[PDB]
Structures are given as structure tokens and as C-alpha cells.
Design a protein around this nucleic acid. Structure first.
Ligand SMILES: [Mg+2]
Length: 88
RNA sequence: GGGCGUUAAGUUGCAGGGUAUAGACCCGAAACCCGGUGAUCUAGCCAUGGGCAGGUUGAAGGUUGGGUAACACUAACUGG
């Protein structure tokens, strides 16, 4: 997984408030990260029909939690995705 | 006793009949062997030049959108 030194960084950048691991801004970023990284890893082997599942489980959550914004505070949704370019 | 012999005179020319050896009365093979001339036709190849009116179909690749976590994938336009 992402280095312990990593998550603690991204959070202080996306976390709705100074140092907080829970809000979508923080949730998403923390997820998209491991997703972008693993992408390369999977570009290798590509036979790990197990590790890939996790890739899905978390990715399936990305689009999932991302909806919470719409269903709730939409004002940030677009402001959050525009950050990682997600959705496209 | 028997077989072959012993009272046939030959031989050398010349003309001729026949034979042997040679092409052997004459004309005729299909082929065999030897040494040369031929790839200006044609078969293959080698180098170097040239030729193919018009009309048609429309692959791969690509750009865009859709699409997938990323690919797959998909539809147009292009491309040829
Ligand atoms: Mg007698």
C-alpha cells in the first residue's frame, strides 16, 4: 500500500480541514492515489486475478463515494474531481 | 589280315569358269563413334532501361466522440 509517509501528506492537501482522514476530498484522493500507482504494477504480471480484485473493490468505491457528493453537496463534487481529473 | 601308298607327269605363261581377301554387281536405311558450329527461334537465369486509358471496392493505421479504473470495445471521418 501507499507509504505511511504518503497518506499523511495527501490528507493535508485534500482533507476538508487541517489534518483529517474521513471526508470525500480526503477519501477520494487517498484512493485515486493507490489506484494510479497500482496501474503500473498491473501493467506487469497482469495474471494476479487476486490483487486486481482489490483494485476493483477500491475503484468501485471511487465512483461510489464520488456520487455521495452529487446526492449531497454537489458544489464540491466538480471541485474535487477537477483536482485529479477523474471522471473525465 | 586291314587302312593309306606303289605303272596319275608335271610345271610355267596366256584366255576363261569358280573361290578367298578386299566396297566385290548397283542404289537405300533407322542408327553407333569422333571433332567442330550453334541460346539472332526457344527454356532458365544475370545486368540495365521502359510499359500498364479509364472506372470500382475499400483492409491495416490514424483523429474525434461514446465508452472502460486502464485496456477491451464502439461509431463516424480519414486513410489508402
Ligand atoms: Mg591295298
Amino acid at each position: 500500500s501507499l507509504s505511511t509517509e504518503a497518506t499523511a501528506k495527501i490528507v493535508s492537501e485534500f482533507g476538508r480541514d487541517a489534518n483529517d482522514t474521513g471526508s470525500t476530498e480526503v477519501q477520494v484522493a487517498l484512493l485515486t492515489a493507490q489506484i494510479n500507482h497500482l496501474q503500473g504494477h498491473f501493467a506487469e504480471h497482469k495474471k494476479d486475478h487476486h490483487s486486481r480484485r482489490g483494485l476493483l473493490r477500491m475503484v468501485s468505491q471511487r465512483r461510489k463515494l464520488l456520487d455521495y457528493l452529487k446526492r449531497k453537496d454537489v458544489a464540491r463534487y466538480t471541485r474535487l474531481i477537477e483536482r485529479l481529473g477523474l471522471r473525465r
